[PDB]
């Protein structure tokens, strides 16, 4: 069933300036988006800011400025940061947007009409930093920035507070079975698997109803009013989760401004999300509440939620490190160094190690070998002669690479997709070392034709599959190889031999990735 591939990042709270956490989440969103564009699919990637709520209002009162001003300013910083990082996100959404508020009111009303929202009370703990209702088993003793004995969350370690309010409640308990049916029927719907097992055991243990409104005094009136009850506001999370639905209904122009809000989501072919990218800290909201809301309203459910191991909500400034080591290099490192854990070190030591060892020595050196005037004397893709069994063993790897990488990208597991490409790059280097084409120019020109061609095609296919990870460097690489534009995109060009012999190399000026001191 052909649709627009819809991939999202979380929308980030604007209480604080952007940092690595948001960058990483949005990078993963971007890379997925980019891969599906390379595949030749229609894409809509979405990122944004979560601007309402008690936490943002209190962050604004701290800086002593009006919530409206504060949110607009920080949202501007988020846009500036994502432009600087050179992402390719299709739209940046803000929950302050009037069209978003409209959607939230439609959704609220639907849920209320379906009989799934009732007037009740919430009496219990709450973390204002996490905007999360917690049960007594999720709290314990700690300290506030005062150094005073207070209660704190087990999840996050943020300070908790008792809440006792008459609140609109969502009948989440009613969706326990349907959610379990969903998890079991679609065993890939939550990645990675151990996070899937967590959600299941949680929902198995039973679900309480969820407070979806709060007394307007509590939130300092910085939130969306409940339809037909201006004393209550919509829970920042029902507000925030609904962005995905809103994004799927916005027509967007050349510039990137929202220009229209279609009534029916089907009109734009985006909903539901194919991949929701999130951090592990917000799994419950995306894997439990969000699908229950959609079930209540009769909306389609997302296909995949992927939860990585950072926290969405000693310094590491990504814009700064990118200026030092290069943008693509940094992205690669972040994507390669870490899978589904915090573990893996992000030090300058290991950062330089990967730059020099993989990007420069493995990829960079290989690109210079197959384009060198010394080795490639004609500056063109040569026509291969007969293939040895060794030739054919490398070709087999190059041919198998796209299918393997495709699966990894789709899981999605971007680390394993990188590892798989680089395994082929390591192979090509070994092959080149064995064949020693520098010697062959003098000894056996017919043999060189064959070696060089395989090497070039290996470099091209690896580079194509790495183009979502190294979007600027892939282009430079292709420019060196003289690969025509049409051959830089599309599944047709995952195939071995897509670029014909006689294709001329691009001119020289020039090192691809420069190495650095330890
Ligand atoms: C619907 S995504 C909401 C995520 C939350 N605002 C955060 O910053 O972590």
From TrEMBL:
Gene Ontology terms: biological process: methionyl-tRNA aminoacylation
Domain Methionyl-tRNA synthetase anticodon-binding: 382-518
Enzyme Commission numbers on file: 6.1.1.10
GO MF, one example: methionine-tRNA ligase activity
Every Methionyl/Leucyl tRNA synthetase domain range: 6-370
Residues in the signal sequence: none
Family membership noted in the UniProt record: Belongs to the class-I aminoacyl-tRNA synthetase family.
Keywords: Aminoacyl-tRNA synthetase, ATP-binding, Ligase, Nucleotide-binding, Protein biosynthesis
GO cellular component entries: ciliary plasm; cytoplasm; mitochondrion
Protein name: methionine--tRNA ligase
């Amino acid at each position: 069933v052909e649709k627009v591939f819809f991939v999202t990042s979380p929308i980030y709270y604007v209480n604080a300036a952007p940092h690595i956490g948001h960058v990483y989440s949005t990078l993963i969103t971007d890379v997925i988006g980019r891969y599906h564009r390379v595949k030749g699919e229609r894409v809509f990637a979405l990122t944004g800011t979560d601007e309402h709520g008690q936490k943002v209002a209190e962050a604004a009162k701290q800086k002593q400025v009006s919530p409206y001003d504060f949110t607009t300013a920080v949202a501007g910083e988020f846009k500036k940061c994502f432009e600087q990082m050179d992402y390719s996100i299709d739209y940046f959404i803000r929950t302050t947007n009037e069209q978003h508020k409209a959607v939230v009111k439609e959704l609220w009303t639907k849920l209320e009409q379906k009989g799934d929202i009732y007037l009740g009370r919430y009496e219990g703990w709450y973390s204002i930093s996490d905007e999360s209702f917690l049960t007594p088993q999720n709290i314990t003793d700690g300290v506030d920035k005062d150094g005073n004995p207070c209660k704190v969350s087990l999840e996050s370690g943020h300070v908790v507070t008792w809440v006792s309010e008459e609140n609109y409640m969502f009948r989440l308990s009613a969706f326990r079975e349907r959610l379990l049916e969903w998890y079991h029927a679609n065993p890939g719907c939550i990645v990675p698997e151990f996070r899937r097992r967590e959600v299941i055991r949680a929902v198995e243990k039973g679900l309480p109803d969820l407070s979806v409104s709060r007394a307007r005094a509590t939130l300092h009136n910085w939130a969306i009013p409940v339809p037909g009850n201006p004393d209550h506001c919509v829970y920042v999370w029902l507000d925030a989760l609904t962005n995905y639905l809103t994004g799927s209904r916005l027509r967007v122009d050349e510039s990137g401004k929202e220009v229209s809000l279609v009534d029916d989501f089907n009109e734009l072919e985006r909903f539901p999300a194919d991949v929701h990218v999130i951090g592990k800290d917000i799994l419950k909201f995306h894997a439990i509440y969000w699908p229950a809301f959609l079930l209540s309203a009769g909306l389609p459910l997302p296909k995949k939620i992927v939860a990585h191991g950072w926290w969405t909500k000693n310094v590491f400034d990504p814009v700064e490190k990118a200026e030092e080591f290069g943008y693509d290099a940094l992205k690669y490192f972040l994507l390669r160094e870490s899978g589904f854990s915090d573990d893996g070190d992000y030090s300058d030591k290991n950062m330089i190690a990967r730059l020099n060892g993989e990007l420069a020595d493995t990829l960079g050196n290989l690109v210079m070998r197959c384009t060198s005037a010394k080795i490639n004397v004609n500056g063109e893709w040569p026509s291969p002669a007969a293939y040895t069994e060794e030739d054919e063993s490398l070709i087999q790897l190059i041919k198998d690479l796209p299918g393997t990488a495709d699966h990894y990208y789709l899981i999605p597991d971007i680390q394993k997709a990188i590892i798989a490409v680089f395994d082929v790059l390591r192979a090509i280097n070994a092959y080149v070392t064995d064949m020693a084409p520098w010697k062959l120019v003098k000894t056996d020109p017919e043999r060189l034709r064959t070696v060089l061609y395989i090497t070039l095609e290996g470099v091209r296919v690896t580079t194509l599959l790495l183009s979502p990870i190294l979007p600027r460097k892939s282009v430079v690489i292709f420019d060196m190889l003289g690969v025509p534009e049409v051959h830089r995109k599309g599944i047709e060009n995952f195939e071995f031999g897509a670029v014909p012999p006689g294709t001329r190399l691009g001119p020289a000026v020039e090192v691809l990735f420069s190495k650095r001191s330890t």
